[PDB]
């Protein structure tokens, strides 16, 4: 059957400023079928507790999910989102960049 690989965006709920509490988001979308594995990483290590939205989809039938966790950004800590899907040979890592 036909498969669609996820698009991935990593970003914060509010403009990031070091020392102020925020939410870190990883939005995965445009994918099919629906099974997908998403991790938020802090300095390369999986954040053990993360929430996600309820499975839904766009008019083109492709699925989307928002994964998110509360965090307080600092200047040194690096964050990323790691995604695996049947369409992907290996997990894809997207780094959090405050300007994207």
């Amino acid at each position: 059957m036909i498969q669609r690989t996820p698009k991935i965006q990593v970003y914060s709920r509010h403009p990031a400023e070091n020392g102020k509490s925020n939410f870190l988001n990883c939005y995965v979308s445009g994918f099919h079928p629906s099974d997908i594995e998403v991790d938020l990483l802090k300095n390369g290590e999986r954040i053990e507790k993360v929430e996600h939205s309820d499975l839904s989809f766009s008019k083109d039938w492709s699925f989307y999910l928002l994964y998110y966790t509360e965090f307080t950004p600092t200047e040194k800590d690096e964050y990323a989102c790691r995604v695996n899907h049947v369409t992907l040979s290996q997990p894809k890592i997207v780094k959090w960049d405050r300007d994207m």
């Binding site: 970003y11 709920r13 445009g30 629906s34 039938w61």
Partner: protein, 273 residues
């Protein structure tokens, strides 16, 4: 202005791991107000739905139970229609609901299905006939015609769907009928001595529909613009950006234009160093 109610339903088989999972998510516009999930540990989303009583919930839960059984049976029949083995996982999706205009009258109804990500069958805009994608869906079409299913769907869409959407809009007025305008800014990042990226930002807006474009000397830069998909912030609102790479020193030839329902008229933004 106009509003919509839509349910997005997903059934997914999982051989060896129990019955197919079924989940139904309801929205008014871009606000999710309910979720039913066959895998929910405890059945008992929006604040304006809280005023609905036990009878409302009884009826909705029964509808969900019916849909769970109907979609699980459909998944079984679909494997047959496509000569597929019993070993793989498959997906059935449906969307249905109504759109109303400013006066709350029906603008149009929706009821359509996809199997494994491909359109299968849909109720036409007339609410009286079907469009089937292939010879399998032609079978469904024959059965649904024989059973007068469209007559029943038209009945729900013109009556119940619209009636409930009006009621939700009335009870949820403060949020459902409030548009939040985008907060906008332009950033500038050199990519080399000779070029820089201008990125036009829109944050905190509702509903999700928005138009962001870059112009150079008043000409749209559609082909040269990077546009990210509109994305949820997590707090009801949405975000989007559009970026263009410009020659160093030419930044003032570029304007970002923002259109959104929450805006009296379009914004025109420039990089301000």
């Amino acid at each position: 202005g106009s509003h919509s109610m839509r349910y997005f339903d997903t059934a997914m088989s999982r051989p060896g791991r129990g019955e197919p999972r079924f989940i139904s998510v309801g929205y008014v516009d871009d606000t999710q107000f309910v979720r039913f999930d066959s895998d929910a540990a405890s059945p008992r989303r929006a604040p304006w739905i809280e005023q609905e009583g036990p009878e409302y919930w009884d009826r909705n839960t029964q509808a969900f139970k019916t849909n769970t059984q109907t979609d699980r049976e459909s998944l079984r029949n679909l494997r047959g229609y496509y000569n597929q083995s019993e070993a793989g996982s498959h997906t059935l999706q449906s969307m249905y609901g109504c759109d109303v205009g400013p006066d709350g009258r029906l603008l149009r109804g929706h009821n359509q299905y996809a199997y494994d990500g491909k359109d299968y069958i849909a109720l036409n805009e007339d609410l009286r006939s079907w469009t089937a994608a292939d010879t399998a869906a032609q079978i469904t079409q024959r059965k649904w015609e024989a059973a007068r299913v469209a007559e029943q769907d038209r009945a729900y869409l013109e009556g119940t769907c619209v009636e409930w959407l009006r009621r939700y809009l009335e009870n949820g007025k403060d949020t459902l009928e409030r548009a939040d305008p985008p907060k906008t800014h332009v950033t500038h990042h050199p990519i080399s001595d000779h070029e820089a990226t201008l990125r036009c930002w829109a944050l905190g807006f509702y509903p999700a529909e928005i138009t962001l474009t870059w112009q150079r000397d008043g000409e749209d830069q559609t082909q040269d613009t990077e546009l990210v998909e509109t994305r949820p912030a997590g707090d009801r609102t949405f975000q989007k950006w559009a970026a263009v790479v410009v020659p160093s020193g030419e930044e003032q030839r570029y304007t970002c234009h923002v259109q959104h329902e929450g805006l009296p008229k379009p914004l025109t933004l420039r990089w301000e160093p």
